Amino acid sequence: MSFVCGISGELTEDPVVSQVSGHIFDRRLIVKFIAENGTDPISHGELSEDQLVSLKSGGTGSAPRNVSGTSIPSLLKMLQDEWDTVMLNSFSLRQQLQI
Amino acid sequence: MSFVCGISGELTEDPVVSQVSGHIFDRRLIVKFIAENGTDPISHGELSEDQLVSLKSGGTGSAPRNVSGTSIPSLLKMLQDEWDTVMLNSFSLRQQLQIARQELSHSLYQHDAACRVISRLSKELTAAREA
Amino acid sequence: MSFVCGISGELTEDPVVSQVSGHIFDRRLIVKFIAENGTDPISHGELSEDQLVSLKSSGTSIPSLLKMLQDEWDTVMLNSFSLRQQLQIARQELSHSLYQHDAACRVISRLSKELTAAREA
Amino acid sequence: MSMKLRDILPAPVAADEAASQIRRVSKEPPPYGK
Amino acid sequence: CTSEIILSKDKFTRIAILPREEQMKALNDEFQMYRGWMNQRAKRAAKVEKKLRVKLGGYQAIHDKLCKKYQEVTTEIEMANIEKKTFERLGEHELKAINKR
Amino acid sequence: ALLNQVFKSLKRAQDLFYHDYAQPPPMPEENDSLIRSMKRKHEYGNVIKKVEEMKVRRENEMLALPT
Amino acid sequence: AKAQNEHLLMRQINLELMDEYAAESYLQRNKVMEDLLTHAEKELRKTKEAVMEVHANRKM
Amino acid sequence: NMQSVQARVHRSPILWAMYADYEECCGTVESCRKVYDKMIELRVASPQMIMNYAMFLEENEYFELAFQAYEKGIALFKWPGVFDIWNTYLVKFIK
Amino acid sequence: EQAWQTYINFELRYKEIDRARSVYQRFLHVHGINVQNWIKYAKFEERNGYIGNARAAYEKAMEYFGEEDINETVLVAFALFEERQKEHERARGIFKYGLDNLPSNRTEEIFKHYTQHEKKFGERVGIEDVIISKRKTQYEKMVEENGYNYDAWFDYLRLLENEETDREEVEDVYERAIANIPPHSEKRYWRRYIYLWINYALYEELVAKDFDRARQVYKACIDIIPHKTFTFAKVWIMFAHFEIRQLDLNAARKIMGVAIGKCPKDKLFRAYIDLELQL
Numbered sequence: 001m002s003f004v005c006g007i008s009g010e011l012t013e014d015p016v017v018s019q020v021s022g023h024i025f026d027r028r029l030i031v032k033f034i035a036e037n038g039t040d041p042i043s044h045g046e047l048s049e050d051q052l053v054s055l056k057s058g059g060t061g062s063a064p065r066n067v068s069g070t071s072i073p074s075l076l077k078m079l080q081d082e083w084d085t086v087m088l089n090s091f092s093l094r095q096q097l098q099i
Numbered sequence: 100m101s102f103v104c105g106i107s108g109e110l111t112e113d114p115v116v117s118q119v120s121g122h123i124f125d126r127r128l129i130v131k132f133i134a135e136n137g138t139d140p141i142s143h144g145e146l147s148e149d150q151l152v153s154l155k156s157g158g159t160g161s162a163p164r165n166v167s168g169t170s171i172p173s174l175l176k177m178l179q180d181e182w183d184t185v186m187l188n189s190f191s192l193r194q195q196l197q198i199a200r201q202e203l204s205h206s207l208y209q210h211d212a213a214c215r216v217i218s219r220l221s222k223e224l225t226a227a228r229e230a
Numbered sequence: 231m232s233f234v235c236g237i238s239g240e241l242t243e244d245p246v247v248s249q250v251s252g253h254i255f256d257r258r259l260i261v262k263f264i265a266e267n268g269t270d271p272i273s274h275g276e277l278s279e280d281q282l283v284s285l286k287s288s289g290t291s292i293p294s295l296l297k298m299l300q301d302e303w304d305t306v307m308l309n310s311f312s313l314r315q316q317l318q319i320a321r322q323e324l325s326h327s328l329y330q331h332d333a334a335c336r337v338i339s340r341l342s343k344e345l346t347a348a349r350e351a
Numbered sequence: 352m353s354m355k356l357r358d359i360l361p362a363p364v365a366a367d368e369a370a371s372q373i374r375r376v377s378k379e380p381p382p383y384g385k
Numbered sequence: 386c387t388s389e390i391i392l393s394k395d396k397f398t399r400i401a402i403l404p405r406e407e408q409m410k411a412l413n414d415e416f417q418m419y420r421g422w423m424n425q426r427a428k429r430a431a432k433v434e435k436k437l438r439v440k441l442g443g444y445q446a447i448h449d450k451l452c453k454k455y456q457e458v459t460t461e462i463e464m465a466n467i468e469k470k471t472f473e474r475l476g477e478h479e480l481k482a483i484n485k486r
Numbered sequence: 487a488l489l490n491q492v493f494k495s496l497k498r499a500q501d502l503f504y505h506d507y508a509q510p511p512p513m514p515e516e517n518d519s520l521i522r523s524m525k526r527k528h529e530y531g532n533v534i535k536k537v538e539e540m541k542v543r544r545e546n547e548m549l550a551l552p553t
Numbered sequence: 554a555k556a557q558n559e560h561l562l563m564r565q566i567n568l569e570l571m572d573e574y575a576a577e578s579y580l581q582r583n584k585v586m587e588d589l590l591t592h593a594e595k596e597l598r599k600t601k602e603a604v605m606e607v608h609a610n611r612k613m
Numbered sequence: 614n615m616q617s618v619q620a621r622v623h624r625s626p627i628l629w630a631m632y633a634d635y636e637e638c639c640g641t642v643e644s645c646r647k648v649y650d651k652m653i654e655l656r657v658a659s660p661q662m663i664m665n666y667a668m669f670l671e672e673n674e675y676f677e678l679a680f681q682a683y684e685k686g687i688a689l690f691k692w693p694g695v696f697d698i699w700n701t702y703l704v705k706f707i708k
Numbered sequence: 709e710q711a712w713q714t715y716i717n718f719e720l721r722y723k724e725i726d727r728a729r730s731v732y733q734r735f736l737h738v739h740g741i742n743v744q745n746w747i748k749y750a751k752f753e754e755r756n757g758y759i760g761n762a763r764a765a766y767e768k769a770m771e772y773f774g775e776e777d778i779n780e781t782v783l784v785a786f787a788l789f790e791e792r793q794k795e796h797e798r799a800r801g802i803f804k805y806g807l808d809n810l811p812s813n814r815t816e817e818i819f820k821h822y823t824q825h826e827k828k829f830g831e832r833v834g835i836e837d838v839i840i841s842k843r844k845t846q847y848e849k850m851v852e853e854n855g856y857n858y859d860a861w862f863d864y865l866r867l868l869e870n871e872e873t874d875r876e877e878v879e880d881v882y883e884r885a886i887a888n889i890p891p892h893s894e895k896r897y898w899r900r901y902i903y904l905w906i907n908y909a910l911y912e913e914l915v916a917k918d919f920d921r922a923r924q925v926y927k928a929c930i931d932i933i934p935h936k937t938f939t940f941a942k943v944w945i946m947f948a949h950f951e952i953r954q955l956d957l958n959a960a961r962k963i964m965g966v967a968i969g970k971c972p973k974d975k976l977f978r979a980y981i982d983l984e985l986q987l
């Protein structure tokens with residue numbers, strides 16, 4: 001059963017749902033959110049780590065490789081180029097929030 | 100809606116989760132299932148109307164789904180799968196090297212086989228002449 | 231505490247022990263070993279995923295961590311290559327040793343037959 | 352219900368075409384205006 | 386021994402006993418041997434890669450087109466959902482204006 | 487010390503296999519296959535959906551499902 | 554040079570496996586991607602109608 | 614198109630009997646068996662041809678193959694025609 | 709049923725055969741609880757020459773009926789189809805697979821086809837295996853009907869001894885046979901039953917060569933005969949001579965001594981006297 005995390009927008013191998021919202025999350029991400037803010041990330045209700053229901057069906061399988069991803073150094077090249085886009089996207093958001 | 104019911108095999112418009120469940124159910128499915136069965140379709144836990152919670156999407160802040168296929172998690176995942184494979188390969192190579200290296204160390208008779216040949220031939224060289 | 235996996239020889243974040251041997255493994259490697267070989271990697275006894283017992287348990291810079299992955303990956307692959315190179319050398323030494331043994335058996339056979347002639351001259 | 356007879360026994364002889372088997376005019380008006 | 390034994394002068398030799406220039410020749414040819422094995426593999430890898438690039442490029446071009454379409458559609462949905470909520474809130478303010486006028 | 491006997495034994499073994507020295511070290515068939523089998527399990531596990539697509543071609547245009 | 558020989562060897566194994574399964578899994582990926590797009594276009598059509606209804610309710 | 618003259622022609626009991634006789638003469642055993650076994654598969658063989666086939670294998674002393682030649686003949690025909698095969702099969706086995 | 713068969717036959721007269729195939733597939737959905745519809749469908753595919761469909765039809769029929777309630781008339785039909793193809797390795801496999809899950813009751817059909825199958829191709833090892841194992845289960849049917857059928861036990865024990873069956877199985881079969889003590893307690897009925905013990909002592913002495921266990925066979929035998937009503941002098945004689953083969957005259961004399969003491973009988977006196985004369 002294919003699922004995606006509401007926090008990151010990526011696939012998740014371990015989907016989980018808060019009792020105080022309908023939205024679904026990757027477990028390690030939402031726990032860190034709860035650990036800082038103690039609240040539902042979308043409904044802003046009070047939330048605790050025991051108010052989670054585990055969507056323990058079969059998680060999303062791996063994406064296929066790109067043809068350039070068939071080698072370990074080219075995966076490291078691909079990982080570096082991926083990271084630069086993620087960093088600059090995060091930088092674009094804080095610029096956009098100021099604007 | 101893109102969630103497919105684990106029982107009916109068709110796409111939901113009313114997804115429901117309960118604390119003893121794990122596969123998704125429709126609201127219009129589970130309530131009749133509670134009435135006839137009273138029983139979880141998959142785990143056979145007891146079902147009650149307070150357990151069911153319904154899923155929603157499109158709330159404020161919800162991140163856009165990454166569709167580009169590449170991602171940092173998936174690359175770190177497959178790099179981890181490479182590492183697991185290479186260590187299990189290296190382990191079976193290291194095991195085979197240990198076995199081969201072990202028996203060739205035990206098989207080092209060459210110097211002692213040679214002394215037996217010397218002992219045998221020096222006997223032969225006397226046996227060849229006492230006749 | 232630092233725990234070392236018997237398969238990888240490296241630290242693990244999730245140490246696991248197998249009751250069939252008492253050796254410590256990374257949970258993910260041993261499950262993949264079981265899922266491929268079905269055996270204990272050290273004792274060769276039958277092993278299954280339910281038999282594992284769990285043991286108890288900052289960043290620097292992203293280009294720096296990526297360069298650690300590069301240098302570390304080259305080290306792991308250097309290990310994998312040198313194992314294959316050393317394995318063939320072990321097989322070449324072994325086949326030579328068996329050839330020395332079998333040739334020595336031919337010599338000892340030959341000489342022991344020739345030594346019968348002195349009893350019938 | 353998954354394997355037994357289909358997967359145990361061996362294979363038969365061929366992947367051929369019987370083994371592949373898988374269930375094996377008017378006028379038109381001229382156009383508007385013209 | 387695996388560090389010490391390298392061929393020279395058409396024989397296997399102890400690396401430490403050779404003249405320095407003979408060590409350079411031995412290590413150079415040892416280097417060129419491994420780079421030969423790399424080149425033999427790399428040309429084969431490039432050959433299979435080139436086949437995969439043209440074999441899979443059509444599936445990739447379809448996925449690339451769908452990504453551009455999907456980004457356009459979801460950004461349109463984003464703006465439309467914004468517009469729904471303001472016009473709904475504006476519709477409430479206009480309803481109060483009706484009563485005032 | 488063992489080093490002398492090791493050296494002489496290795497040197498003779500290398501010399502006997504001298505014509506093979508230019509060949510790269512092999513990958514054993516057991517080791518090559520266990521890499522591929524792990525890759526088929528953990529990476530290409532989506533082949534489960536390949537046989538479901540093959541199943542769909544059997545369920546469409548063919549016989550009855552169990553009762 | 555020893556390390557690169559293994560990276561190329563693992564590349565060969567990956568490419569040979571990729572040659573068996575990429576053509577299907579890419580087709581499988583594209584099918585899911587088409588499902589996402591048609592679901593998103595279904596949402597786009599639904600919300601465009603909802604936006605036009607608010608204009609009609611206001612105009613009415 | 615399956616023109617009936619050639620399409621029938623391999624149902625050739627006169628000709629299969631002539632072919633089998635030449636394989637006894639010149640074939641050696643293993644080719645001769647294939648010819649008779651094909652003649653069974655076609656259902657061209659008479660009960661006389663099953664008994665001839667068994668007597669060939671018996672005269673070669675492949676006695677066990679003779680018994681199955683009878684057995685396969687018994688699968689081919691039905692009563693009364695099997696009766697001579699059973700008579701020969703059961704007495705030959707019994708001895 | 710007859711409505712679908714008439715519609716199928718209608719399309720066959722046109723030679724529409726793929727449309728006729730559509731009718732069968734719908735026919736099996738409604739009716740397919742009945743095996744014969746599947747076998748007739750597979751025969752329809754076979755005779756047209758679609759044989760890939762015919763394999764699929766049988767294999768789906770087995771999957772349809774399941775793993776446990778094996779509809780084995782399908783399984784035999786599937787086996788014999790593959791036999792007709794010359795798939796014969798498959799045909800053994802189907803028969804052999806059936807024998808396991810079917811083992812007592814339904815195998816009676818399997819074995820008659822399976823033994824015909826092997827009668828060609830089995831010839832050295834396959835014929836004798838299936839016929840003996842057929843015979844073995846066939847004698848066990850006779851024993852389930854009547855454990856008092858001594859002639860079925862003797863014929864069964866003959867088969868297992870010629871098999872050179874493992875000793876513990878032959879002991880279990882002798883001890884099952886022996887427990888069927890005649891209900892009449894008059895010697896006219898025991899005359900066949902008593903050799904069911906003597907054969908056991910001969911097997912233990914000659915084949916198992918466990919002389920200390922052949923003592924127990926005779927003691928168990930003599931503890932079962934109703935001596936104060938009649939005796940088998942054969943038993944007392946054979947038990948006496950057995951201990952002489954163990955060189956134990958003291959045991960042999962005790963056996964013959966209690967023989968005369970319990971039931972003084974002419975055959976005992978003659979045997980005891982002839983023994984002491986030889987001694």
Ligand SMILES: O=P(O)(O)O[C@H]1[C@H](OP(=O)(O)O)[C@@H](OP(=O)(O)O)[C@H](OP(=O)(O)O)[C@@H](OP(=O)(O)O)[C@H]1OP(=O)(O)O
Pocket residue numbers: 939940941942973974975976
């Ligand atoms: O009682 P006896 O006059 O000594 O006769 C015995 C005895 O016959 P009974 O049935 O009358 O006892 C034996 O029979 P069993 O007690 O052993 O059953 C019998 O043995 P068979 O039944 O095996 O014939 C034997 O005959 P044989 O010695 O030929 O075995 C025969 O002895 P006679 O020949 O002296 O009558």
